[model samples]
Target: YEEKVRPCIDLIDSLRALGVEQDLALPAIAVIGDQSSGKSSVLEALSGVAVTRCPLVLKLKKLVNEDKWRGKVSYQIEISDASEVEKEINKAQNAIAGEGMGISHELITLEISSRDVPDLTLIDLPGGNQPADIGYKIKTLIKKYIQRQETISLVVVPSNVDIATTEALSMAQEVDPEGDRTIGILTKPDLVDKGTEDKVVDVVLVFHLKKGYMIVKCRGQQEIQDQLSLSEALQREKIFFENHPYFRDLLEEGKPCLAEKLTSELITHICKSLPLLENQIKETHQRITEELQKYGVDIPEDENEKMFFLIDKVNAFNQDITALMQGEETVGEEDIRLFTRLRHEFHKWSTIIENNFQEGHKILSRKIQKFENQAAAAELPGFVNYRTFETIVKQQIKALEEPAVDMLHTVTDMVRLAFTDVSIKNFEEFFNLHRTAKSKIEDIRAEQEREGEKLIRLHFQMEQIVYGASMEEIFQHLMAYHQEASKRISSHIPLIIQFFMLQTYGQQLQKAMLQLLQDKDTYSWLLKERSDTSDKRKFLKERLARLTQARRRLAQFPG
Candidate 1:
């Protein structure tokens, strides 16, 4: 498995080329530490090359042997001088972040292909010591990288600080609770206080890590100022450990040994993660192919076939809509079902339309009381005021029309919303198809609104002409059963509003929506999109068409 580790890197690099890494966590060494930690120095020591970036990605080409380093910079890609690093890094960060208010998720990659540089790929984000400044997101960024199972956290912490107090180690622990994939790198051990040196030894032996820990005292700022070569720095570090009586037993044989350790860790990580990554990449490819299928194949060249293809999509769209209305459509485990939502909207329509009736009935009752007061002296006891009765009935019936109209609008909007949502879901990949369906729904809703309001007005209007027989009926029956007549009349008026406006119209609008889509004339507007979609479909077809031709020229697999 270790023999072919190059393919794992290539697989990752290919997915990276396709931008899968943006969404999926790829196997990588996430180099992380506190702003004060010697995190940057550790990477610098390993690669023997300095790096900096201004919200940019740095790519280092491959070389088997160590050479002098150079860099270039861009918004999307960056390169900088290897000799002058942290200063250059600060300048780059300030340029990207601007003044004291600075931050970004961008990286400065120091790509060094040297005998000393390890085989691992790592992401280098900026360093910040400030508690709440630019590095506030640094913790969040490290968590994103480290939380993934494929990631190996290479945590660098200064030995001078209490091991328990280091933010970087705590963060790694948060992600890798068991410390399975975490490797603790204790940098700047030389800086540890005289009495506190034992703590560093305790951290090395007692630390929580399956990958174990390593101690390295990287060349710091003063070492670089004295023009110390990286190879020279490595020798100096090894000798410093041996001469120290207390720290002499440490596992060190210079940078190559450290390189081999990291390379082996990465190679093992790559081998272990490859099978899962392979499946993930295959799934991603499969899902995209499925989506492209939903967008559909090119419209057939023949006119009959083209029309048939279009018809199938519209039919499927209608099916999903029907499912939604029947409470059959479900996207998955969601609380609100589409048709259930529609039912709730209908209930609201009934409530709001009939809401005013309790108060309205009292106000209407007082009108009859006014007539009773005026006729107190006239003694029209057995007689009824035909005009007053007609006026009161008319006013109340008219009162219902506004609420009736309101219910018509609210209910129609709800149904229209359901209709549009279903249509879009079915037709989402067929962009212009869904847009046309949406356009037709809007027209149908407008037309249906007027029709609903028209029927309501006509229902009320029928009551207006109840003059001739109703006059005698009111006089003969009005006094004899005045109480019951008032009850019957006032109650019946609101019932008419409720029935014709909300209950009847909702079903009518449903049928209208169904009928609207089936009408060929409604799709006339859809033809307008052919000007663009045809070219797009054709381009896609020809692009995929060459897969056969391209396959002919490629090397054959073992049969």
Candidate 2:
């Protein structure tokens, strides 16, 4: 089989190699069918490119009869990588349209290249049933052409004729014995009136060919209102075949049917014979044991253990034997059936595991909250020592501000690392931790602001000493100090502004990570609102409540 199929396979391999090395190589398709079967017409219809000129020209007089002349017809066809077959169909249709009810050419070949269909090239072969010498010559040329490069061969046939001809069957077998990739197109079905459609269908069914077929109807320009009508018809038929009951059943049966069944039967025979063989061996063992007993001997303890082990081993062997008898090899039909049955079982277990994890996290979060509240109550006195806490928080804020500024240097270093790496790899790894670290730094900066504000509100008397000692000028000095603090804070504004900008871009990275965990490919493209700046600012404003509550509970050290 491989020798018979080698030429086609080798052609595909060559094309694949060329495609890997260069981007501009053409993907090719070939068409084959019997004479007068409208194969050319089918090809023309698919390609949308006219192979020939129209026979009749419209006149203004025809407009009175509701007929309007249009320019020479041009068409656009949308097809996939394997679009060469359709291009040929378009050419054949134009050729037929030019003849306008007669055959002008015995065999038509057309080639088209456009940016519209950049990935495909088409070849339309002459129909079979020429003189034997001519047919042989054409077949040899086709074989060579197919061997030269990879091609998708479309075998076209008319529905009204049986496909069991020696030549037709031979060609089908040669092209695709498995019949999985071959597509049979039944053309010119409209020639047979609606009443005779069933008769044409019956003619096709009588041949017992299992790959089945597609139908095409010839229509004039007036009949087709738009391209979508033809697209709809084709899509509907494709869907119908995909969902067809008999077709599904045939697919479920699988391949190499006779050999598979014979192997199963042989396994069953071996399983049935095994128990009898075991019984015979056991009876011989019993006779030996009786003779041993007559000689006043008993099996040793180790021998007893070995006997039990052998029995267990024999039972396991029977289970494996049964599985083989049932044709339950890995990835076999029986295994697939077993997996289908267990699919819901696995899903139920997965859901249970997920729910349990969520419940566990909720319980853990509640416990952590309780511990935090208890710790806060125990430390209330120290937290609300107005003068002491204020001074400590001010010092802490000053110490943290400089380090926070230095962290921006770390981000700049990451960018430098990326630039220095000539391989352009490992850059993502260099920045992977920066996003989380940046978010944490912003949180710490907010905390520092809250601490600074607390100190300003708590120690009004100490502001004179902290500033300069202008005793009677307290309010002016405090305001001036606040103004300087605000300016110092504003110096970090650009760095804070950068954090927000990176966060906006970081959302795309976050969404990509979520998609990876969820196993989704295409992502939603909706715009999302940024996090509220007011929420961060509010944390700074709400500092006195905790101190006031602590004082009400008489938890304080010094003013």
Candidate 3:
């Protein structure tokens, strides 16, 4: 346990350098299992914490009744001075157990602290069979926590049960895709016969192997009790490598020392996995680029600049993804309407460009027709013999010049309309709406900060009462205060700002539709100017549409 815990801690520190910690709460691993399935018991046994199911008053009385247990049964476990790994585990445990003083509805979190295990936090979820939908609630909660990149999950199933059962297997695979961070705990093996236990172990092994997993097996409670120190447990697990076929060959060859050999194997696995992951990311980026191009959107010329813009877009996507993963409330219908308006705007731009090109071509054909007619009439036989026939013919040819000038002027007018009617108007409106939305978002953020500060102050006041100043009265006051505060904060003013952004953008989309109606000629001229390639024309149209749709959501906001 020490060796494994140590490396995890180091991983956490390394990840922190990469800014994973601040972005994530802490790297947490949750243990989830069915009720009375030894879930809490295992956590208590492993962590050396006492397990009890007594009511809050009784638990408090028991803790205070004994002098030896006075400090141990406090409401909160302080791990400020503990190692990084210890801190994380203790924090998670205490969060669930409520400082060991009494049961509370507040979330339990254990922070890992140890020199070697700095990067990990362990969470013990409530038993799956707890009353009043606790099992479902906990399942949902665990899912949300694991979706966070920094958090991992462990699903504990008793050895006495079938590992391949639908619920067990599905939950395991869903949480641990690669099995890199997941561990299967076969609890209470002593209850089963030795042969049955062995069969159960085989079942677990087969299931994991089929799913491409690496598993570790822990025996009964007595062995765990004997190896109380994490270091000893790690050593015991390490010895299992002697029997592994892959390691056995290396040992026989004697090319490298055992420690070096194992490290090399781990590094090789990491190297192989990393390239595959990178390829996946590359493929995704390529697909996005192709899709954008299909709509006539070119990647910005500067790679770094394009990446910067993409990062911002990804951030917005991430926020939405996070909320969805957490099962937060759905977005409003007004917001969806705004998005629809933006999409319509894009269609308008596409149509406008296509229509303009067709009109320009028609005008060009008409002018050619008029010129040919004049030439044909002047070249008649009776007129050909006349001395002034040549002059008349030349004058008729010159008459064609008026229409030619008119054609050029018409094209120029269309171009001007394209620039002003479509581009400039849409851009200005979209920009203004975006700015307003951003300002409102900032205001909501400020309000949340102010409220958070107030809550902290109230918490401190309540703490003062706990230190020999009317504990029950202070507790009741603080609970009511916080309950009200929570209700007030949950009103979700931030959602209003989100809705406004989408609406404002939607309204701006109307600009695109108007531009399409007014600037058809300009789009036609542009299409002709660009080598008459329908694809190019299509591209321009799509780009225009995207811009319009992006702004369409702003329609919902008030002026």
Q: Pick the lDDT winner.
A: 1
lDDT to native, each model: 0.56, 0.36, 0.38
In candidate 3 the C-alpha lDDT for residue 384 amounts to 29
Better of 1 and 2 by TM-score: 1
Candidate with more favorable, higher lDDT: 1 or 3: 1
TM-score of each: 0.51, 0.24, 0.30
Q: How accurate is candidate 3 locally (lDDT)?
A: 0.38
C-alpha RMSD by candidate, in order? 13.7, 35.0, 33.0
Candidate 1, residues 239-310, lDDT tens digits: the string is 666666555655442223455677667667765765565455445545545545855454454555445655
Candidate 1: where are CA atoms >4 Å away?
Answer: 1-3, 6-11, 51-81, 84-101, 106-110, 128-133, 194-202, 219-226, 252-256, 296-559
Highest-TM-score candidate: 1
Candidate 2 lDDT over 444-546, as tens digits, reads 3344434433433333224324633242253344334443443444344323423432332233223332332221221111111123333432432332232
Ranking by lDDT: 1, 3, 2
For model 3, the superposed segments whose C-alpha errors exceed 4 Å read 1-31, 37-133, 141-154, 163-167, 170-183, 193-272, 280-427, 430-559
For candidate 3, the per-residue lDDT at 432 reads: 37
- Identify the runs in model 2 with alpha carbons over 4 angstroms from their true place: 1-28, 51-122, 128-133, 143-152, 174-176, 197-212, 220-559
Measured by TM-score, how close is model 3 to the native structure? 0.30
